[PDB]
Design a protein that fits this description.
homotrimer; Rossmann fold; 5 strands; Dephospho-CoA kinase (chain B)
Chain lengths: 206, 176, 206
């Protein structure tokens, strides 16, 4: 078995910065967003199911998914969102499980943007939340995208609140910094996680 | 952005008594029930457009989402009080910055509901059986306000809470 | 109104051993899996509805449900599973409520294997988790069924983690050993649950 530490945070919290810091210590990172992309790659069962359901025009000349087309085709039929999700849900679960089993690091870091929203913390052994102020989320996202404060605040309104995330966190790491202290903070967490992972299979009492 | 304090409680907890005390202090109250009705009003978009309930959900949820969001942006108070009867049941606390639970004994829930709605004790117990439990609400509460007594007895707690919420609302966006 | 103490635990935690210990102390045990069986017993309208929907072969010559036959008809088939849940979920809810209402013990022990997975703890006044190490879950499951360690890890991955259960538990009882080892803990919990049951209806403050 593999010890699973789930990492989550809101838009603009810099989850990648924290994940890369754990990757630097030899931890394998399994990213929910990458897995979702991997399950619709050429050859994947989901791709054929998608073409069969939405039609051949969802497939590009090279056989890959026309994501933009499908993305806009869903918006034009939210009911379709459900069929798609019901299709991909099982596949993402199986591919995620596969990649976790394949990781050889002491424990794995599973990055899940929607950890709180979809209650996926129930599938984690430990929950780490990358925390930052709402201003930081707004600032960074804008500087990385567009439409000033609006648009983004529309995103923050659609995600779980800062407080909702802290409510389910076992550990919290601040990323308002530079990250001047992320390397240090990550090192401390790593030490604890190595300990938790080496004893979790046989530990008789919590 | 606007700070959201969610208010919830079981049937007979007197949620309105508490919400009106905040309303009197100048806080805009956004009522989930009021909004649910507004979404299905005369000439509403929803009207123009087992099982069938789910189809009806994919329709009413987004609209309810947008309307709630609209009332929150037009509110003029430092923070808003979002009254959500099914906060625990529907996990809507994940959308709140703070959770206030109006708490009472099951005895109070029974006595008040039977009185106000003139119904049997076995009838209200059925309702209590269908809503989250007292302890389930307490598990997600940031703040708890006892409402077992008369309306005037909550004054002290409302004043402490309102001052705390004003402070949280003023600092939350930049709070490191 | 009866006080409801929900009991849960992962596969191999020996949930029924704990439940039986409380039953021996005079507590009415309300088991979700037993309730599901009761609602499809001979004479129940749900049984006839199942035969009408899936076929007469769903019923045995002695009038009882052919359990594996039904499972085979819903396995893989999402629509048939949905249909069966739509039929049974309400009946199970009603029967459970009914048996809780008629129980004679001050508090009941509601045994729910999927308590955390399905957020059913929201309907309990107290949550008792039967806790065991993952190692215990693996060994017991491997001995019970003719399965491999990996087969069991797949099951474990489909259930909430040990930590997720502990996060919502009010009380925890260790069941890594033999049945007698829990007698003392069950007696202590029992005494406390009678106290909570005696005060909960009129308790003014939490």
């Amino acid at each position: 078995m593999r010890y699973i530490v789930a990492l989550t945070g809101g838009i603009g919290s810099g989850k990648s910065t924290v994940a890369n810091a754990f990757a630097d210590l030899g931890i394998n990172v399994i990213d929910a967003d990458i897995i979702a992309r991997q399950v619709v790659e050429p050859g994947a069962p989901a791709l054929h199911a998608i073409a069969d359901h939405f039609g051949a025009n969802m497939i590009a000349a090279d056989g890959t998914l026309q994501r933009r087309a499908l993305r806009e085709r869903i918006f034009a039929n939210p009911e379709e969102k459900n069929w798609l999700n019901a299709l991909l849900h099982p596949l993402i679960q199986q591919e995620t499980q596969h990649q976790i089993q394949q990781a050889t690091s002491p424990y794995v870091l599973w990055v899940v943007p929607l950890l709180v929203e979809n209650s996926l913390y129930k599938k984690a052994n430990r929950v780490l939340v990358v925390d930052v102020s709402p201003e930081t989320q707004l600032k960074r996202t804008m500087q990385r995208d567009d439409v000033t404060r609006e648009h983004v605040e529309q995103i923050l309104a659609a995600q779980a609140t800062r407080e909702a995330r802290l409510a389910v966190a076992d550990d919290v790491i601040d990323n308002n910094g530079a990250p001047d202290a992320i390397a240090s903070d990550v090192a401390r967490l790593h030490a604890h996680y190595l300990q938790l992972a080496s004893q979790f299979v046989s530990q008789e009492k919590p």
